Amino acid sequence: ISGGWFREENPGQAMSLRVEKVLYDAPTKFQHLTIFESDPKGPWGTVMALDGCIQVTDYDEFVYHEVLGHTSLCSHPKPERVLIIGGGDGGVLREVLRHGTVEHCDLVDIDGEVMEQSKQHFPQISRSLADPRATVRVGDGLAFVRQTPDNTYDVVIIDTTDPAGPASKLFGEAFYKDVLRILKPDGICCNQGESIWLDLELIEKMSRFIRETGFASVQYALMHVPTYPCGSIGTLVCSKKAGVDVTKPLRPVEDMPFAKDLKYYDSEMHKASFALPRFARHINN
Amino acid sequence: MPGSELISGGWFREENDQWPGQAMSLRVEKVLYDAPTKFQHLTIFESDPKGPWGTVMALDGCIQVTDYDEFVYHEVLGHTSLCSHPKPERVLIIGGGDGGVLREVLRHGTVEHCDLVDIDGEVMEQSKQHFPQISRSLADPRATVRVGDGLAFVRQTPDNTYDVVIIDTTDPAGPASKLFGEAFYKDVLRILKPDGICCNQGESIWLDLELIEKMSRFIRETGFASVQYALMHVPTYPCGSIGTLVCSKKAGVDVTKPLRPVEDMPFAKDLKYYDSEMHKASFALPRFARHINN
């Protein structure tokens, strides 16, 4: 409520944001969705949470959306067809659609209410959802990839909630076999790759099963997000083709017309993301 | 501003008007220390043993160290600076009474002596009592630890005394206030030898960007040839990161690329965060902050 504290806890730590006004707080068909304006004496703006876990804020949203969208597309030689699983807020889709190469993007999120509330309360995040290059569907991403042809996509971006709720299977090897299949030979996959502080064991598990399922290479890109647990998150950037080094940008964004509208990502930051703290560096070898 | 009332209903809550609208919280298993010293409010507590954080120290309600992530800031301060220097033999730490940066500095076989001057002797005594893995080098024969204001210490120190000066302070509100000022950086530039390096506690790009820009400008104006900010990942600092301004007295020095890589040192494998790839990556800043570095 106004003057209280949205508190995110799931051990012995919580990140909290002061509330100015609650805009929406209700059950969807799948999740508990909350949207509030945080204290205007702070920089956060409007905040969206799902099942108690912060998803986007006005002040820092650009980080994760730019890192997912551009690290993957600038690693691809000519990304024309893209799939986003999850991503119902539209942020990754806004970034992907900056690229002049993209002809079509399909976005599939299980919760149609996330798209609706993002259109109502996060116009700068959701502008993309109406673009005629995108087909936006309500549905489970695991079912979607199981109905999708081999060799459909240049890039697949898995922008999901954590393993504990409706995204559970999207962190498993069966799903990843299907993502490898629906990618074209030169395809790239990236995901919501979780934390090196909280989820190191899961990142090592997934990096190994993704490689073993048939991806030629898998590297974790670390990013700074103040409102995600412990202040960061990462993405596993995976290449179907051997001999690809996703840690150096193949097509640097500085050669693109929208490079100077980005707030976080550029080529120095792309290369820097793959340097990991010594305790974690074995992820990237 | 803050003291004992941040410990409320089972938790320490990092509420501060230096970061409005937010607060990191850690749960409290047992308060170990909570009292005003001669200069600051010192709080030490054991966090939830079900969590990883261990013991936690705060000053004037600002989290300073936890057991679990202290290695990050101490390794980055200590090794980014020394690894940027051709032969760092004489080092000064202003602040740093927990000993963490000193522990890292003393890994270096080049160091003949390090002086440490912290205003608050209570911080050193409680670090020895409650953070032994952090404070393990305070009594080293290669260190001299003194209790006093760093502003006075630097003004008394002769020209051309130190190869590296590390300014490991609390925030600008309390006793560290003048350590974020031009007058003080004048003295640091003077006490450095010609090929000196300094670095500091350079605050947050998400909360203090305007302060970082101001320090960067006046450090260059005092006469330092180059100033670059290195960003690092610290979960228990506000917004989950902090930085350091790494400054070269001499021109032609690229502090962003290690001069003496740590990998050619026998203790490289002992570090938990820092290495040369992390050193080079730390100077890459989000586009909105990149003007701090050029």
Ligand SMILES: C[S@@H](CCCN)C[C@H]1O[C@@H](n2cnc3c(N)ncnc32)[C@H](O)[C@@H]1O
């Ligand atoms: C909000 S987005 C994360 C915020 C940063 N863009 C995570 C989305 O993942 C969706 N999600 C969770 N599970 C699934 C499945 N199984 N399929 C598709 N999308 C899903 C969920 O409905 C969110 O809108």
Ligand SMILES: C[S@@H](CCCN)C[C@H]1O[C@@H](n2cnc3c(N)ncnc32)[C@H](O)[C@@H]1O
């Ligand atoms: C705890 S240390 C930072 C935590 C990571 N090592 C910050 C130290 O700055 C000291 N400090 C603050 N002001 C000054 C002055 N003016 N002089 C010296 N040391 C100072 C203060 O007593 C802390 O122990």
